Write a protein that binds this ligand. Structure first.
Ligand SMILES: Nc1ncnc2c1ncn2[C@@H]1O[C@H](COP(=O)(O)OP(=O)(O)O)[C@@H](O)[C@H]1O
Ligand SMILES: [Mg+2]
Ligand SMILES: [Mg+2]
Ligand SMILES: [Mg+2]
Ligand SMILES: [Mg+2]
Lengths: 158, 162
């Protein structure tokens, strides 16, 4: 089945990468709501926040979500896409949601902050769980997660 | 590990397609020996054949096989690669060999050294060369599956990237 697949998780969990790798395996399209926002508005999140604050950033993010959602597409979402209940509902409704979970220690170690990742997870862990259909060990290699997800979700390859 | 992985099997078995997906999944370089040969000589098979026939192309193919067999590389090989003993000895003694198996029917459906009905040729090719694929192969996998599944299977049976 071809419902949109939303990858959620905190900063450092490998959403874009795994998201892009899963899309390839399934023959889907791939879109990252942070990247889309940047390359369509011209603005960074610091640009958006400085001009309209976190509330205007959050609104714009919700709008991106609705804009990019479509079948045969994997969507990587920003880390705080799960703060707004309306966003959490939209994802379970339109598609299937996958949470890439990694403990703060390991989220911190990913740098291509451990106290900040710890507090992000105190706030959001529960929202990640609430919104997810499937939860997968994000500390594996991307290819391995793609494989595990095709098995768990029962998705055929391209 | 890091030793060259050789993809073998007959025309239509997916060596290039599956090889690139495997490379990509491992973060490894991919090479195809037919493409390597093209670019380092400038001659298409046809140019080579014209001058030195098929025995010539085989000679240059053997050479290329030895040129491209390096670490963290997935090497896709031409069909005929396994006819020579030297090529078989080389591959097992420098890397790990994967045989992408598929039935002749299926190899002929993929159409999208010729002779007669595609299907009948491929049947005969496979009937004689199957012992050769099996001999050289370390691992054998069902190439009728889609590429990303073949990759997943191969990563589990080969214990990669582990
Ligand atoms: N696992 C597969 N499942 C379905 N089709 C495949 C698979 N692998 C390859 N194909 C298709 O089969 C044909 C064989 O392509 P190719 O990769 O060049 O094979 P080979 O290098 O063995 O000649 C192509 O049309 C390719 O797109
Ligand atoms: Mg749904
Ligand atoms: Mg849940
Ligand atoms: Mg080929
Ligand atoms: Mg064998």
């Amino acid at each position: 089945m071809t419902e949109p697949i939303f990858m959620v998780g905190a900063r450092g969990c490998g959403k874009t990468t795994v998201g892009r790798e899963l899309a390839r395996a399934l023959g889907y399209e791939f879109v990252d709501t942070d990247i889309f926002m940047q390359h369509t508005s011209g603005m960074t999140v610091a640009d958006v926040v400085a001009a309209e604050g976190w509330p205007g950033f959050r609104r714009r993010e919700s709008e991106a979500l609705q804009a990019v959602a479509t079948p045969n597409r994997v969507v990587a979402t920003g880390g705080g896409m799960v703060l707004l209940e309306q966003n959490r509902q939209f994802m379970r409704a339109h598609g299937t949601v996958v949470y890439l979970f990694a403990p703060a220690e390991e989220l911190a170690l990913r740098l291509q902050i451990a106290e900040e990742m710890e507090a992000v997870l105190r706030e959001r862990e529960a929202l990640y769980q609430d919104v997810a259909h499937y939860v997968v060990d994000a500390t594996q290699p991307p290819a391995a997660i793609v494989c595990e997800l095709m098995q768990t979700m029962r998705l055929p390859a391209a």
